[PDB]
Amino acid sequence: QFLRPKSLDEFIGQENVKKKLSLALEAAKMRGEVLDHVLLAGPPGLGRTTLAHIIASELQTNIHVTSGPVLVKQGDMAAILTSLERGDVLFIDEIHRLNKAVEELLYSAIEDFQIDIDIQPFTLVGATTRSGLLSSPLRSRFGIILELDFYTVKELKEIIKRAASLMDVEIEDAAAEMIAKRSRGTPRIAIRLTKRVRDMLTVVKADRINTDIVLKTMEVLNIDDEGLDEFDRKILKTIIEIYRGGPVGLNALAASLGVEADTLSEVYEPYLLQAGFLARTPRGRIVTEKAYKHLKYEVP
Numbered sequence: 001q002f003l004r005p006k007s008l009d010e011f012i013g014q015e016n017v018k019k020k021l022s023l024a025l026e027a028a029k030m031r032g033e034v035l036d037h038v039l040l041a042g043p044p045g046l047g048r049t050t051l052a053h054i055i056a057s058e059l060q061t062n063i064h065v066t067s068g069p070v071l072v073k074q075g076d077m078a079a080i081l082t083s084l085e086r087g088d089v090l091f092i093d094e095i096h097r098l099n100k101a102v103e104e105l106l107y108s109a110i111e112d113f114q115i116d117i118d119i120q121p122f123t124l125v126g127a128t129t130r131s132g133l134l135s136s137p138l139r140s141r142f143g144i145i146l147e148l149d150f151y152t153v154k155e156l157k158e159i160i161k162r163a164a165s166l167m168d169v170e171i172e173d174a175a176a177e178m179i180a181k182r183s184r185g186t187p188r189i190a191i192r193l194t195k196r197v198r199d200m201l202t203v204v205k206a207d208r209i210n211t212d213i214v215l216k217t218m219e220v221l222n223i224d225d226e227g228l229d230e231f232d233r234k235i236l237k238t239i240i241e242i243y244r245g246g247p248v249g250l251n252a253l254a255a256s257l258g259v260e261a262d263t264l265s266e267v268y269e270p271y272l273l274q275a276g277f278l279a280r281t282p283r284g285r286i287v288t289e290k291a292y293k294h295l296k297y298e299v300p
């Protein structure tokens with residue numbers, strides 16, 4: 001809520017994305033034109049939803065939030081489309097999860113702003129974990145595709161220091177750095193960790209968040225020096241123990257973990273791959289030497 005950027009000026013990091021989006025936004029506003037469709041792609045907690053709202057606010061139009069799975073029958077999509085006002089933003093999270101029914105109606109609406117038997121010109125903003133998850137057709141409809149990658153430790157530290165300030169708590173630089181290094185490159189994680197560290201500060205009655213307080217918090221939260229949580233470790237341990245380090249297929253791995261292949265590949269794998277703990281091969285996923293050493297498993 002109060003911790004969510006209200007404009008690009010408040011949006012830390014993602015310089016490439018900001019410059020690209022800013023170019024298009026400022027131009028459209030200056031011409032009083034409807035912004036071209038925008039695709040926001042990247043792992044969760046990186047700011048896709050945040051950017052969608054910023055786009056609407058900058059254009060000074062209304063944003064209509066919806067989810068791919070939430071829309072089943074064309075009736076749901078129609079009601080939403082016909083409620084759009086000129087320049088409004090239609091934000092669809094998990095846009096790649098749109099069934100053939102609603103998707104066909106959407107592709108149609110953005111071809112000439114009209115349906116089966118007239119829609120006000122609008123800007124479609126989709127959010128997806130992976131741009132490839134989108135069908136070839138609908139995918140070619142976005143004039144602006146923004147690929148968000150994990151944030152740097154420095155950017156995360158800045159976001160953490162900002163969140164602490166908004167929560168009325170002081171924090172030392174080294175402490176903010178420590179949280180950033182454990183935030184798995186994600187703003188969402190960094191902010192939630194900061195709230196939990198704030199709770200520790202409260203209970204120990206300290207004047208400001210320091211490294212000691214952060215370490216105490218990480219121990220309680222079971223977050224290791226690499227920012228890995230319980231589930232991250234379970235993924236690596238399962239590959240190591242049950243599958244001898246891999247390669248193991250995504251479906252097989254998800255079945256053993258008792259989770260959907262999607263949550264695995266879309267939510268947890270991205271950072272594990274980025275940080276060099278996991279690798280993908282044609283035969284399946286495998287763990288790296290870094291994984292064994294980090295989890296203290298003898299390298300076979």
Ligand SMILES: Nc1ncnc2c1ncn2[C@@H]1O[C@H](COP(=O)(O)OP(=O)(O)O)[C@@H](O)[C@H]1O
Pocket residue numbers: 001003004005010011012013014043044045046047048049050051127159187188191
């Ligand atoms: N660049 C950023 N600067 C500051 N906070 C950010 C940034 N990106 C994301 N956040 C924060 O992290 C949380 C997660 O963002 P959100 O936009 O909901 O992620 P996504 O839709 O990609 O899953 C939000 O609370 C938000 O206010």
Ligand SMILES: [Co+2]
Pocket residue numbers: 249250251
């Ligand atoms: Co497979």
